């Protein structure tokens, strides 16, 4: 009979958020935390709200804060004990309801890095796949598996303080993924844009992003590599390069973009 | 055992030679007042009370006695030290007020981070300015030594 304290907020009453304690028999519940939450909703309090889809850790929708550390509920294990298992929303996020965070800023920041392949020449008619060696494909190994759970984001003390100026670990790793993709031909443009004091150099190497990553990725290592590459490759003309690309995006629609 | 603090030899000479009282100037008064107290766990340095005594005595400005000359040199070194203390308070006040006005529209965290450091910096800058304008930077090593000689000394028998 484990005790599970869960954060609760009603968006309509707008009463101060509180932790409600539930008792669940682990014998009739699945090993993972998400199973306990589903059981609570099914049996005791159906009002409980939380995001969940894949159940196998791949969608990245069940990101929560369990006993202090961020994680995905579907991959997290229930750890029985006298101490209540405290489940709260993602740290320093606006709570839409109960355990459902507001990750709209995270989605916007990602759209800013323009995560789509860019090439100077359009695929000539009669052309097959763009060549990439096995070794080049190996470079993109630990970076293309990010499920956007947003745990590393909501674990960085620097994203807690400057959420609207710092891109955050996940977005920065994704930017390195596209700066490291041999097929992309806009390496300099991407590095010039990311070379900003607020966007990139707000990372102080806390390493909370790597510790909490549910997919076992290392966003901290990627940001360090991206900072070294930028420092070595900087040229006086980078600012003009950013401006020219901004002119190219003049007719784009209203949303975050390279500028 | 028992310890005995007695006037030092320099104090003895200064008392023998004092011709009259000496008017304390306004800046000397303020400097002594603004001087931090000193806790004498052991007695090795001059405090504000010893400095006042030195500055309240008067000596003959023409006297050619070598002993009197030492006393006058010491009194001048003590005077430069005392009037130099008048610059700390201006520095600390401006070192908090000017930063606070500048960060008056910023959050509490910013004032906690900045004001303590600017206060010490302003106080240090004020101390540098005061010691500089009191002619301490041009004193010789003989002048500074005579102005730092203790006024009370533990008695050494025999």
């Amino acid at each position: 009979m484990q005790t599970f304290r869960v954060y609760r907020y009603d968006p309509l009453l707008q009463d101060k958020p509180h932790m409600q304690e539930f008792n669940i028999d682990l014998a009739q519940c699945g090993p993972m935390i998400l199973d306990a939450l589903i059981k609570i909703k099914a049996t005791q309090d159906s009002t409980l709200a939380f995001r969940r889809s894949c159940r196998e850790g791949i969608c990245g929708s069940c990101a929560m804060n369990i006993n202090g550390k961020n994680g995905l509920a579907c991959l997290q294990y229930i750890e029985p004990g006298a101490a209540p298992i405290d489940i709260q929303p993602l740290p320093h996020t606006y709570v839409l309801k109960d355990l459902v965070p507001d990750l709209s800023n995270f989605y916007n920041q990602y759209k800013s890095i323009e995560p789509f392949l860019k090439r100077r020449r359009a695929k000539q008619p009669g052309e097959k796949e763009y060549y990439q060696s096995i070794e080049d494909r190996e470079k993109l190994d630990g970076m293309y598996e990010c499920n956007l759970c947003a745990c590393c984001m909501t674990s960085c003390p620097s994203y807690w303080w400057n959420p609207e100026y710092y891109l955050g670990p996940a977005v920065l790793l994704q930017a390195y993924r596209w700066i490291a993709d041999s097929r992309d031909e806009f390496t300099t443009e991407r590095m010039a844009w990311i070379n900003d004091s607020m966007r990139l150099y707000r990372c102080h190497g806390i390493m909370n992003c790597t510790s909490c990553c549910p997919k076992g990725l290392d966003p901290a290592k990627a940001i360090a590599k991206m900072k070294a590459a930028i420092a070595a490759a900087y040229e006086p003309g980078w600012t003009k390069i950013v401006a020219q690309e901004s002119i190219a995006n003049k007719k784009r629609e209203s949303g975050m973009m390279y500028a | 055992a028992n310890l005995l603090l007695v006037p030092s030899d320099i104090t003895i000479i200064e008392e023998k030679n004092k011709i009259a009282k000496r008017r304390i100037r306004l800046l000397e008064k303020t400097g002594l007042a603004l001087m931090f107290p000193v806790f004498h766990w052991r007695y090795s340095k001059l405090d504000k009370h010893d400095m006042y005594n030195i500055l309240r005595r008067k000596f003959d400005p023409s006297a050619s006695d070598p002993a009197i000359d030492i006393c006058r040199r010491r009194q001048e070194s003590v005077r430069r030290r005392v009037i130099a203390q008048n610059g700390l308070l201006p520095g600390l006040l401006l070192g908090v007020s000017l930063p606070w006005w500048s960060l008056r529209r910023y959050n509490y965290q910013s004032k906690l981070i900045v004001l303590p450091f600017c206060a010490y910096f302003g106080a240090i800058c004020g101390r540098i300015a005061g010691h500089g304008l009191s002619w301490r930077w041009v004193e010789t090593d003989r002048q500074r030594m005579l102005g730092n000689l203790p006024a009370k000394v533990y008695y050494r028998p025999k």
Partner: protein, 82 residues
């Protein structure tokens, strides 16, 4: 609290509203002005500071080494401490 609801926002570079960004630029100038002024402290120390043991030093040079060329026999033990 409450906040003004009829603000005339800047329309161009020659029709500007006074905002906290312009105030921050004045702060930049005033802080930088302080730095120019505080440079007078370290510069004054280096210019006015003299490191001399007594008033004898200058008298020795006036009477024994006026041209700064007179050579003194060197007894190492004097300043070697042994």
């Amino acid at each position: 609290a409450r906040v003004p609801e009829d603000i005339e926002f800047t329309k161009n570079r020659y029709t500007r509203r006074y905002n906290l960004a312009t105030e921050d630029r004045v702060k930049l100038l005033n802080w930088n002005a302080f730095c120019i002024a505080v440079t007078a402290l370290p510069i004054a120390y280096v210019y006015y500071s003299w490191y001399e043991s007594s008033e004898d030093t200058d008298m020795i040079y006036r009477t024994m080494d006026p041209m700064r060329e007179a050579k003194a026999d060197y007894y190492l033990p004097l300043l070697r401490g042994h």
